Structure formats: structure tokens, C-alpha cells
Design a protein around this ligand. Structure first.
Ligand SMILES: CC(=O)N[C@@H]1[C@@H](O)[C@H](O)[C@@H](CO)O[C@H]1O
Ligand SMILES: CC(=O)N[C@@H]1[C@@H](O)[C@H](O)[C@@H](CO)O[C@H]1O
Ligand SMILES: *[C@@H]1O[C@H](CO)[C@@H](O)[C@H](O)[C@H]1NC(C)=O
Ligand SMILES: *[C@@H]1O[C@H](CO)[C@@H](O)[C@H](O)[C@H]1NC(C)=O
Ligand SMILES: *[C@@H]1O[C@H](CO)[C@@H](O)[C@H](O)[C@H]1NC(C)=O
Ligand SMILES: *[C@@H]1O[C@H](CO)[C@@H](O)[C@H](O)[C@H]1NC(C)=O
Ligand SMILES: *[C@@H]1O[C@H](CO)[C@@H](O)[C@H](O)[C@H]1NC(C)=O
Ligand SMILES: *[C@@H]1O[C@H](CO)[C@@H](O)[C@H](O)[C@H]1NC(C)=O
Ligand SMILES: *[C@@H]1O[C@H](CO)[C@@H](O)[C@H](O)[C@H]1NC(C)=O
Ligand SMILES: *[C@@H]1O[C@H](CO)[C@@H](O)[C@H](O)[C@H]1NC(C)=O
Ligand SMILES: *[C@@H]1O[C@H](CO)[C@@H](O)[C@H](O)[C@H]1NC(C)=O
Ligand SMILES: OC[C@H]1O[C@@H](O)[C@@H](O)[C@@H](O)[C@@H]1O
Lengths: 58, 92, 797
């Protein structure tokens, strides 16, 4: 969820995200090592992921 | 930054007088300081422009663009450990 | 006749006994105060030294565990295996304390249980023993913080953290003080066409943060190259990065725009030219050039060979923003020079990156064995734990792992962190007793930079910068800006900074405590350097405050009648009475309501600093004698609304007992404007009451008068007390009318004007009434003015 942690082990705990890019008004938020909505982890997952691409959506 | 102002007596002389020339008119004033006391007595003439404000009013400090030309005396620290030959420049 | 100055003179004179006028030498006092403050600072330095030694020795043997799921570290995280603490409402720090362990404060954006953090917790957990050792071998020590170079903060007296927590020890001024030596910054903002949009926002925010990470003892400037290296601001050279200059640079940076074509060669040439302006009082050490840009394609090899041949200057470079431009040139520019290359992908990465160059700047001092372990006191700044004004001593702790094995191939060139101790100005103030001096006298000390330290005019609130705008910086007041500055005081300031010890006398103008009057008086300055550190404690004594009265009492019977002299129930026949909140031993210290303080003092004296209480009791006795003898006699004179007498020690007495309800003067005598002013002059002083006050006054209180009670005990001028009266307005209106007539005082405050409308608005500053009268009056060598500045004030906008 935080863009400055390129691995799960370093992606934990809270982090500061700024609303709409203004330097002021920070907002605390947690870090989640979330995967893409559609991912190629499996062959089955790949097939459904590629299906939407064939549908010109997402 | 508030810009305070205060006023105080300048001359030890007591008697003062003159004329006031606000506009197309004349006035008479005579001043006299109460001896052995911090008071001044003046007699202005009846009414016939720009308000002086001794109350502190918000204002910007001295223009820093001008003060840096002649900075106040300053004696900084005299150690500043830097420039050691036995240093590693492999970090980037 | 009403106040009876001569009557009090006689009352004091007849009782020659109970007086022993010791002389304030003005030199032994400053000497001893300097010695005591030096001793306190050396105590703190010793504590820091031992803490640093213990921390380094503990770090030397850690073994770097990597599986903490078992044998979990035990610590008390402030932001609430954690600990359950039992808190004692200790009044020393004004908040809950434990004294049984050192709390921790992991910044919100650092994972609590990371592998690197947990190791820091583990090896620092042994520091609590030495923390307790220090706090036990001597009390009154506020904090011991170990600002590890990972964001941690292990402060010994464990209190809950004082809403989003942005605190980060690696950015606090007391950390940057020890992390690296002073600098000569030069930020090369890249305002070129390629940085339009988000990149420019990131550049401006990062530059502002960087300027926020500069102490008040290092210089800075902000250039910019867009095929032409201009300057965003009005300075055109290095400008000390003060509290003010930072604001100018921040505004200039905020008001920039992307345009033109990038030109690194010309920009770097301009930059290297600016750092060679040796005749502008530069802090000639740690030269730096921190280029900001999106991405380059030309490495200025020729410029780096023309200037910076010997690698004198360092060059950091930020590749701010998300883009796809080449970064090889920037990395190479950082690498060739003794610098380091960073990246700022987006907001959030600014705070953790802009502060990293201090790690690089610390390499030479780390490589220096022990010449760098020098306690380095900071400048006054508001504490992060809401404690007041505290100056922090700092001492870096180095990384000694593999020492005595001579491996010397490791990351032993980076400090573990700066770890400091805190000294509160309220603690220094009790080493310089003001009560022996007259209300006008006081102490003050100044940084080498001139910034004041322990000055009466230093109020605990942020120093203002510019006018506020419609919708943490240290409290640094330059010594000339804390008082009226002239051509004489500047010489004193210059001499103190150099450490020269000498005494000077002259006649200067003092801004009264109400910021509404100015008077001429003599102020024999005196200064000396505290050899322990870099400071210059001063001392201001008027010519009439050389000698002071100290009371000696042994009968204990007169002490009794003095003890019940100021009882609350004797007011009806002895007039109301105040007592100054002075430290009469551990007696309760009052805050707002003086009545309970008087009751507590009565209880304390009934039960049983001895000289100070003796002086207060003697003053109470003499004031009671005066009031009962005379003021009880000619009660309620025709035009005397009320009568009051103020002495030293804190005895203020008002006779009618009804004017007390309309007595706005502060109970403390040393803070009473009229008292100091009345001492300053040698004639009756009239105080015009304020105008349009939410509270009552100017008709039911009356104008105030005062006159210092000069005394000659043995040929020495003394002005211990002041006797004044509050003349009723109506009676002396009747007087004046019996004789456009305007009665006025210095400061242009209408006491009366014959016209009824004017005297209706009595007390308003004359000048909102007939401005032209004064506008001409100021021109004829009467009613001059001194347009001074007050940097500590509050505004509505
Ligand atoms: C003596 C020792 O413990 N050295 C290691 C070092 O090799 C490693 O790079 C670092 C990061 O975990 O931790 C430490
Ligand atoms: C710099 C310095 O210490 N100066 C003098 C020193 O020469 C002298 O011995 C001492 C008292 O004797 O007073 C001080
Ligand atoms: C400081 O300097 C010297 C000590 O050698 C002496 O003249 C002076 O009394 C010293 N005072 C203090 C407070 O250190
Ligand atoms: C300095 O420390 C010593 C040792 O605890 C103590 O006796 C002395 O009073 C301290 N000095 C001050 C000024 O607190
Ligand atoms: C480090 O952790 C181990 C295991 O928890 C512990 O035995 C050791 O005491 C810790 N280090 C220190 C300095 O206490
Ligand atoms: C911003 O800088 C430009 C530079 O020409 C200037 O014209 C403009 O007045 C400045 N605006 C402010 C608010 O300082
Ligand atoms: C200071 O140095 C600059 C740059 O070399 C030069 O232009 C200027 O004349 C110098 N001024 C003085 C007073 O030395
Ligand atoms: C201290 O230096 C050693 C050198 O090997 C390093 O392993 C260690 O991590 C350093 N200290 C910390 C707290 O990282
Ligand atoms: C006093 O100040 C208030 C401020 O709101 C103003 O409304 C009122 O008219 C003033 N009155 C006088 C007598 O100055
Ligand atoms: C005030 O004094 C100045 C300077 O002497 C003079 O120029 C001016 O005419 C005088 N009168 C006024 C109304 O300013
Ligand atoms: C205050 O004003 C007087 C008279 O105008 C002048 O002589 C003096 O130098 C001024 N001092 C300051 C500090 O402004
Ligand atoms: O001591 C072994 C440890 O050294 C350090 C890091 O490289 C760790 O990944 C490793 O497990």
C-alpha cells in the first residue's frame, strides 16, 4: 500500500499518507501487501485475468 | 511581530508654544511641564487628519533583504570536523 | 501628604537595627553565578559522558540476533512485549512519571517489530541501568534521551507521549547538533521546463523541509538554473539560515515556476562561484551543494574539474518525482564528489530522505577518534514534552564493533545516534537569585551567536516571523532585539561574544514593563565568560542598587507580631495586603489566587531560605506600622480614593480594603510596571489607566501616582519601597475646572481634557484625538519616539 517498501517483510505497520497531495493534513493508514486484483499466480488465475483483457475492461 | 512605540520627554525646557497649520486655519498651543512631576500641560484651541497610534500594531519585521548586507557580529564554532582522508566514497 | 514618602523614610530610619546593608559588588555576584552555572553544565556533561561510554560499550557486543519471536524484548512503548507501568503524579516534570524504566517512542511510520528496530530495543535495554544511576546520583535532571539513528527515542523518565504523531528524533534540533558539524548549504533548485507539474510541488516541499532541517548556526542559499542561474530570493549569498531568513527562502521557493531549458553546467558554475564568496562572513567549513532535479543527461565533468578539483565541496543530488529520465549522470555526479545520491518518489518519502545527508556529513567526525565527543549545548527551544524552555546538551555515540581487531572494513563510519540531556531555563534561573537586586536589575547570558539565554524579556512562546496569513523552531531572541538597541549596547554584545570580561557604565533608555513608557537611567553592565562552555553571563545594576537591606532577627517575639501582622482578618484595620509568590522554602507555590497563598504562608509561619522570609516579615511589619500610625488616622481624604504602598519582598498594602477589588497590579513587586518605573525616575510618576478594558477602571479606580522612598541609612542611596495613591477622577476634575485645556503625560495619555467628551474617554492614548497637535509637537524637540520591535506577540489574523 505504501509505495516506498518493495517487499512484504518491510511492508507492515502504519504509514503516513497525505490527502490529495497537500503536504499539510496527514492521514495515518496501515500498510497492506495486497496483490493485484487479477494476478498470474496460477494458470487458472491467469486465464481469468487474461479474459478481462480480452473484454477491453480493466 | 508587533511594532511597539513609546514617547518620552526630550528637552529639559519647560515652556513651549507655536501655531498649528492643519489647513486654511490657525491654532494656538502653549506647553508647560509640571516641575518635579512627570506631566505636561497644553492648551489647544477648539476644533476648527491622520491618527497617531501608540498601540502596537501587527507588522512585518525589518526587511531581511537589507539586514544581511551588514549582519550582526557572530563568532561561530571552531571545530567542524570535516575533510578526513580516511573516508569511504563507495556510497551513492 | 497622602502617601507620606518622608514618613516612611523616617519610619525606616528610626529602626536602624535589623539592617545590614551588604553591597552587591556587581563582580563577585557575576563571578559566582557564572561558576554555579558552569558547575551545572559540567554536571550534565559528566552525565552525558558516562551515558555515551556505557551505550558504546554495550553496543560493542550485540551479536545481531534475527529471530525475536522467541525471547521477546520487553519495553514500554510510550504510544499506548509491552510493559504495564505504574505512574506517579510527579510535579517536577508536570506529568506522569515512572522512574522504573525508560519509555520508547517509535515514530508512527516505522514498523514496531522490524528486525532492525527490535535489535535496537534489545541492546538499548541495558541503558536504563545507567539512566537510573545518573538520575539517582543527583536529582533535578529532566530527561536523558538516546536519539538512536533509526527513529527510536529512549527517554528515561517514562511518561505517556503528549492528533497525528509526526515526531522524529532524527530531525529534532538537538539531534542534528551532534549528528554533523555546521554546513554551508546551497540548494540548486532545478526550475526547468521538465519539472512542471507534480515534480515542482515535490521540489518545493522537499526544499522547505530541508531548510527546516538546518540549525541556526549554519549558512544556506537557494539558487535555481533554467538556462540561467538566478536566485529565487533577494539575498545573493549565504544568509545564516536564521529563523527569519528561512522564512524568506521558503516563500521564494514556494513562488517559483517551471520554464526554459535545463543547463547543469551554468548552474553548477554559478553554485561553485557562490561558495567562494569568502568575504561574507561564511561559516568556512562543510561546503555542500544539494542539487534538486528530475533527471539529467549531461554530467558537468568540465565544471567539476575546473572547480572542486580537490573534492573540497560535497554534492548531494535528489532525483525527485516519478519519471523515466536518465539518472546515471546524477548518480555519477554524487559519486565522484564526496556526496551521496537519493530519490524522492513522492510525498511521504521527503521526511525520511531530506534528513539523511547528516549521516554522510558525520563520516569525518566518526573517523576522528575522540576529538568529536564534545558536549554541544543547543539554543533555547520549547520542549517536545511540554516542559517549558530547555537547552539540550548533546554527545554523539559512535559505532565500535570490531574495535581492537583492526578490521577497519565495516560500516563503522556512521554514528549510532546523538543522545542528549535537558536543562530547563527555570533551573538556571534559580542559580541567579534576582531577589537580592532591585526590580530593575537582572541577569542575562547569550549564545556565541548572540541569542539570549535566561533573559527577563524572553517569554515562553514561539518567536514570530512575518505577518500571519489567512487560512517547532527554536525560541531565538537576539540580544539587541530583547531590549532597546543603541550604539553602546552593540559594543557590549560584541565584547561578550568574544569572551572579554569587563565592566561598562552609561545612560540608556529602558522599555518599561507595560510597553507604554520609556525612561532615562544609568545601567552599569557587567559580563564574564563561563569557562566551562561558550557563554557570557551578564548583569545589569542601576547606580542606586549597589546596596541592599537584609534582615537579621533572633528574638522570635517581633517575628510573631510580624507573622500575624498580615492576617486576612486584620484587613479592616490594617488595609488589604498582598504577598509576592516567592520561594519561601517548600511552601506551596501559587498560580492565580493570592488569597490561598497568603493563607498557606500564614500556616507555614505558624509552623515555623531564611533571609528572604525574614525580609518579607520585616517589610510587613514596617508597612503595618506606617498604615496604622498614619493611614489609619487621615482615612478617606477628600480626593484620595485609595492609598497603596509597595515594598520589596512582596509586601503590597492597600488601605481602604475596597480598592483591592479594583487593584489590577500583579502581586509580585518585581513585575509591577509602576514600581520599576517609579524607581527609575526621581519624581512623582502618573500612570494613565488603560482604555476600553473589559474590566472596570478609569472612573472607579482613579489615576495612579507613585514616588520611590529614597533613603540614606549611612550615606548610601536606597529605594526599597514605593508609596502611591489613586486620585479620584471627579475631585480633580473639579479642581481643574475651577481653574481647550489638556493635562498630559509622557506617552500622550489623556489624564483630562477640559471638554467633557475627551475626559469621558480618559486614559486613551492622546493621538487618536488631536493627531495634528502631536504631529507638530514631535517636530519641536519634544515627544521623541523609539519604534522598537516585539518578536513575541499574538495576532488574530
Ligand atoms: C557484525 C554484524 O553484526 N554485522 C552485520 C552486517 O554484516 C549486516 O550487513 C547488518 C545488516 O543486518 O547487520 C550487522
Ligand atoms: C585567563 C585567566 O584565568 N586569567 C586570570 C588568571 O591569570 C589568574 O591566575 C586568575 C586568578 O589568579 O584569574 C584569572
Ligand atoms: C573564568 O576564567 C578564569 C578562570 O581561569 C577566571 O578569570 C574567571 O574567574 C573564571 N570564571 C568562571 C566563572 O569560570
Ligand atoms: C553537581 O553534581 C554534584 C554531585 O552530585 C553535586 O554535589 C553538586 O551540587 C552539583 N552542582 C549543581 C550546581 O547542581
Ligand atoms: C539481547 O537479547 C537477549 C535475548 O532476549 C538478551 O539475553 C540480552 O540481554 C539482550 N541484550 C542486552 C544488552 O540486554
Ligand atoms: C512571484 O515571483 C514573480 C517573479 O517575477 C513575481 O512577479 C511575483 O510578484 C511573485 N509573487 C509573490 C506573491 O511573491
Ligand atoms: C568579495 O568577493 C567578491 C567575489 O570575489 C568580490 O566581487 C567583491 O568585490 C569582494 N568584496 C570585498 C569587500 O572584498
Ligand atoms: C555498528 O557497526 C557494525 C559493523 O559491522 C554493524 O554490523 C552494526 O549494524 C552497527 N550498529 C547498528 C546499530 O546497526
Ligand atoms: C471598545 O472596543 C470594542 C471592540 O469590539 C468596540 O466595539 C467598542 O466600540 C469600543 N468602545 C470604546 C469606548 O472604545
Ligand atoms: C516635521 O519635521 C520635518 C523634518 O525636519 C520637516 O520636513 C517637516 O516640514 C516638519 N513638519 C511636518 C508637519 O512634518
Ligand atoms: C530613540 O530616539 C531618540 C530620539 O529620537 C534617539 O536619540 C535614540 O537614538 C533612539 N534610540 C533607539 C534605540 O531607537
Ligand atoms: O548474521 C546473519 C545476518 O546478517 C545480516 C543480514 O544480512 C541478515 O540477512 C543475515 O541473516
Amino acid at each position: 500500500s505504501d509505495s516506498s517498501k518493495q517487499t512484504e517483510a518491510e511492508c507492515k505497520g502504519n504509514y503516513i499518507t497525505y490527502k490529495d497531495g497537500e503536504v499539510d493534513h496527514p492521514i495515518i493508514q496501515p500498510r497492506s501487501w495486497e496483490n493485484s486484483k487479477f494476478d498470474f499466480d496460477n494458470v487458472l488465475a491467469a486465464m481469468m485475468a487474461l479474459f478481462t483483457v480480452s473484454t477491453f475492461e480493466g | 511581530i508587533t511594532e511597539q512605540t513609546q514617547y518620552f520627554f526630550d528637552n529639559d525646557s519647560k515652556s513651549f508654544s507655536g501655531v498649528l497649520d492643519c489647513g486654511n486655519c490657525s491654532r494656538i498651543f502653549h506647553g508647560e511641564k509640571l516641575m518635579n512631576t512627570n506631566l505636561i500641560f497644553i492648551m489647544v484651541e477648539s476644533k476648527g487628519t491622520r491618527l497617531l497610534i501608540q498601540a502596537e500594531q501587527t507588522s512585518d519585521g525589518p526587511n531581511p533583504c537589507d539586514m544581511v548586507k551588514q549582519p550582526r557580529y557572530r563568532k561561530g564554532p571552531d571545530v567542524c570536523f570535516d575533510n578526513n582522508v580516511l573516508e569511504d566514497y563507495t556510497d551513492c | 501628604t497622602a502617601s507620606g514618602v518622608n514618613q516612611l523614610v523616617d519610619i525606616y530610619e528610626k529602626y536602624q537595627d535589623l539592617y545590614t546593608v551588604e553591597p552587591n559588588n556587581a563582580r563577585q555576584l557575576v563571578e559566582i553565578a557564572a561558576r554555579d552555572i558552569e558547575k551545572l553544565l559540567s554536571n550534565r556533561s559528566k552525565a552525558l559522558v558516562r551515558l555515551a561510554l556505557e551505550a558504546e560499550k554495550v553496543q560493542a557486543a550485540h551479536q545481531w540476533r534475527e529471530d525475536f519471536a522467541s525471547n521477546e524484548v520487553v519495553y514500554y512503548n510510550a504510544k499506548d512485549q509491552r510493559i504495564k507501568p505504574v505512574f506517579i503524579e510527579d510535579a517536577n516534570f508536570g506529568r506522569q512519571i515512572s522512574y522504573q524504566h525508560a519509555a520508547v517512542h517509535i515514530p508512527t511510520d516505522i514498523y514496531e517489530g522490524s528486525t532492525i528496530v527490535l535489535n535496537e530495543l534489545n541492546w538499548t535495554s541495558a541503558l536504563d541501568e545507567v539512566f537510573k544511576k545518573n538520575r539517582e546520583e543527583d536529582p533535578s535532571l529532566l530527561w536523558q534521551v538516546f536519539g538512536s539513528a533509526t527513529g527510536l527515542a529512549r527517554y528515561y523518565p517514562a511518561s505517556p507521549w503528549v492528533k497525528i504523531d509526526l515526531y522524529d528524533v532524527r530531525r529534532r534540533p538537538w539531534y542534528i547538533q551532534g549528528a554533523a558539524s555546521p554546513k554551508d548549504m546551497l540548494i540548486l533548485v532545478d526550475v526547468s521546463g521538465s519539472v512542471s507539474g507534480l515534480t515542482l510541488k515535490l521540489i518545493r516541499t522537499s526544499v522547505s523541509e530541508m531548510l527546516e532541517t538546518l540549525s541556526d548556526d549554519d549558512f544556506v542559499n537557494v539558487a535555481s538554473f533554467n538556462s540561467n542561474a538566478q536566485d529565487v530570493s533577494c539575498f545573493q549569498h549565504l544568509v545564516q539560515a536564521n529563523v527569519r531568513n528561512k522564512k524568506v527562502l521558503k516563500d521564494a521557493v514556494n513562488n517559483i515556476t517551471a520554464k526554459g531549458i535545463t543547463d547543469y553546467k551554468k548552474g553548477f558554475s554559478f553554485a561553485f562561484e557562490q561558495l567562494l564568496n569568502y568575504n561574507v562572513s561564511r561559516a568556512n567549513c562543510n561546503k555542500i551543494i544539494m542539487l534538486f532535479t528530475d533527471g539529467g543527461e549531461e554530467r558537468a565533468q568540465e565544471i567539476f574539474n575546473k572547480y572542486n578539483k580537490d573534492k573540497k565541496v560535497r554534492v548531494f543530488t535528489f532525483s525527485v518525482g516519478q519519471h523515466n529520465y536518465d539518472r546515471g549522470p546524477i548518480q555519477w555526479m554524487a559519486c565522484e564528489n564526496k556526496g551521496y545520491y537519493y530519490e524522492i518518489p513522492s510525498i511521504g518519502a521527503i521526511r525520511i530522505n531530506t534528513q539523511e545527508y547528516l549521516d554522510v556529513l558525520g563520516r569525518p567526525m566518526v573517523l576522528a577518534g575522540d576529538k568529536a565527543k564534545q558536549v554541544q549545548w543547543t539554543n533555547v527551544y520549547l520542549d517536545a514534552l511540554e516542559l517549558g524552555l530547555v537547552i539540550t546538551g548533546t554527545l554523539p555515540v559512535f559505532n565500535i564493533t570490531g574495535q581492537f581487531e583492526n578490521k577497519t572494513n565495516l560500516k563503522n563510519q556512521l554514528i549510532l545516534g546523538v543522545m542528549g540531556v535537558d536543562v530547563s531555563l527555570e533551573d538556571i534561573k534559580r542559580l541567579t537569585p534576582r531577589f537580592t537586586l532591585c526590580p530593575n536589575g537582572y541577569y542575562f547570558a547569550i549564545d556565541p551567536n548572540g541569542y539570549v539565554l535566561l533573559h527577563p524579556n524572553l517569554q515562553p512562546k514561539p518567536i514570530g516571523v512575518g505577518i500571519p496569513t489567512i487560512n517547532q523552531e527554536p525560541v531565538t531572541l537576539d540580544f539587541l532585539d530583547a531590549e532597546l538597541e543603541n550604539d553602546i549596547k552593540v559594543e557590549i554584545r560584541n565584547k561578550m561574544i568574544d569572551g572579554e570580561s569587563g565592566e561598562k557604565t552609561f545612560r540608556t533608555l529602558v522599555k518599561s514593563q507595560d510597553e507604554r513608557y520609556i525612561d532615562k537611567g544609568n545601567r552599569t553592565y557587567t559580563w564574564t565568560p563561563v569557562n566551562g562552555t561558550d557563554y557570557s553571563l551578564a548583569l545589569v545594576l542601576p547606580t542606586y542598587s549597589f546596596y541592599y537591606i537584609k534582615a537579621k532577627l533572633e528574638e522570635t517575639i517581633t517575628q510573631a507580631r510580624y507573622s500575624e501582622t498580615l492576617k486576612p482578618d486584620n484587613f479592616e484595620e490594617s488595609g488589604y495586603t498582598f504577598i509576592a509568590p516567592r520561594d519561601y522554602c517548600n511552601d506551596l507555590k501559587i498560580s492565580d489566587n493570592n488569597t490561598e497563598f497568603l493563607l498557606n504562608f500564614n500556616e507555614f509561619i505558624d509552623r515555623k531560605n531564611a533571609d528572604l522570609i525574614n525580609r518579607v516579615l520585616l517589610d510587613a511589619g514596617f508597612t503595618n506600622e506606617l498604615v496604622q500610625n498614619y493611614w489609619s488616622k487621615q482615612k478617606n481624604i477628600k480626593g484620595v480614593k485609595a492609598r497603596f504602598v509597595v515594598t520589596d519582598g512582596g509586601i503590597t498594602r492597600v488601605y481602604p480594603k475596597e480598592a483591592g477589588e479594583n487593584w489590577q497590579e500583579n502581586p509580585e513587586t518585581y513585575e509591577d510596571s509602576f514600581y520599576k518605573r517609579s524607581l527609575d525616575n526621581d519624581n512623582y510618576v502618573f500612570t494613565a489607566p488603560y482604555f476600553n478594558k473589559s474590566g472596570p477602571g478609569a472612573y472607579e479606580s482613579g489615576i495612579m501616582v507613585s514616588k520611590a522612598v529614597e533613603i540614606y541609612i549611612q550615606g548610601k542611596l536606597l529605594k526599597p519601597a514605593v508609596v502611591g495613591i489613586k486620585i479620584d477622577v471627579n475631585s480633580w476634575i473639579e479642581n481643574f475646572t475651577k481653574t481647550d485645556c489638556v493635562i498630559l503625560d509622557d506617552g500622550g495619555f489623556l489624564l483630562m481634557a477640559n471638554h467633557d467628551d475627551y475626559t469621558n474617554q480618559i486614559g486613551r492614548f492622546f493621538g487618536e484625538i488631536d493627531p495634528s497637535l502631536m504631529r507638530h509637537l514631535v517636530n519641536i524637540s519634544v515627544y521623541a519616539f523609539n519604534k522598537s520591535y516585539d518578536y513575541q506577540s499574538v495576532c488574530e489574523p
